[PDB]
């Protein structure tokens, strides 16, 4: 996270750390949507151009972590994957369009004060909360800065970010933005910064329903041009836009 702060213990019970067995390394973020399914971006898994194609056995999902590095025993739980499902129409070729992926747990994960799922948005909530100016919150153990001169943070990081208008998003970049993406961050005019960085991808972009006090995942951290650059915005999978899909595999495959 660029310009964030140390999160609070228990602050993001849905926070999933997608771990790599050899080498032992942070790979991405993800979120716990149920006792069996984790939610992530496809790009953490499949990026042909980067020779990136991870399989059910390359990864380890550690939930309930706080510390970036320490094996937090009796607190965190390392779990094994059944299957990975990538959106059939994910577009790594052109705009990373449909950057979504479901990961299935080998066994149900026991909820604790540290392990708790976030909700998926419905039409009405998605409707009333997904509006510009409206601040979401991003969490992850990614980089503090785009490149670090002088995988960085001690603990899970936090940053709250303003949802930006389409046309603003579209002006920002040269990439073909789609209905399935959304952008966030402070305009170069608002003297305020922060963003998701490298190692923050696939993690959750959540906002709180002033109606029910529930926290909802509105987006998955996607692509961007560097981290925290003036005039550019961070891009996000439109979680509610792809719900028909989630809903579908989740019941095809249980």
């Amino acid at each position: 996270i660029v310009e964030g702060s140390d999160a609070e213990i228990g602050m993001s019970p849905w926070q999933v750390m997608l771990f790599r067995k050899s080498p032992q390394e942070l790979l991405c973020g993800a979120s716990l949507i149920s006792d069996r399914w984790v939610l992530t971006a496809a790009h953490c898994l499949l990026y042909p151009p980067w020779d990136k194609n991870f399989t059910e056995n390359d990864l380890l999902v550690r939930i309930g972590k706080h510390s970036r590095t320490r094996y937090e025993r009796n607190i965190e739980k390392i779990s094994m994957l059944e299957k990975i499902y990538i959106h059939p129409r994910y577009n790594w070729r052109e705009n990373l369009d449909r950057d979504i992926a479901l990961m299935k747990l080998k066994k149900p994960v026991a909820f604790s004060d540290y392990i708790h799922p976030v909700c998926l948005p419905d039409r009405e909530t998605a409707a009333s909360l997904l509006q510009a100016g409206y601040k979401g919150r991003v969490t992850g153990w990614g980089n503090l800065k785009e490149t670090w001169t002088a995988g960085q943070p001690s603990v899970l990081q936090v940053v709250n970010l303003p949802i930006v208008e389409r046309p603003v998003c579209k002006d920002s970049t040269r990439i073909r933005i789609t209905d399935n993406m959304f952008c966030a961050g402070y305009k170069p005019d608002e003297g305020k910064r922060g963003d998701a960085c490298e190692g923050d991808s696939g993690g959750p972009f959540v906002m709180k329903s002033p109606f029910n006090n529930r926290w909802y995942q509105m987006g998955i951290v996607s692509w961007g041009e560097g981290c925290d650059r003036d005039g550019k915005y961070g891009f996000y999978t439109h979680v509610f836009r792809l719900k028909k899909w989630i809903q579908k595999v989740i019941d095809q495959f249980g």
Partner: peptide
């Protein structure tokens, strides 16, 4: 349900240090 109601906060009726900000933003 219980989805999104955090046992260390929303459950003991406690607020986290930066949540205010949000709620305020849904102005």
């Amino acid at each position: 349900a219980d989805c999104g109601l955090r046992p260390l906060f929303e459950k003991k009726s406690l607020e986290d240090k930066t949540e205010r900000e949000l709620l305020e933003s849904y102005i």
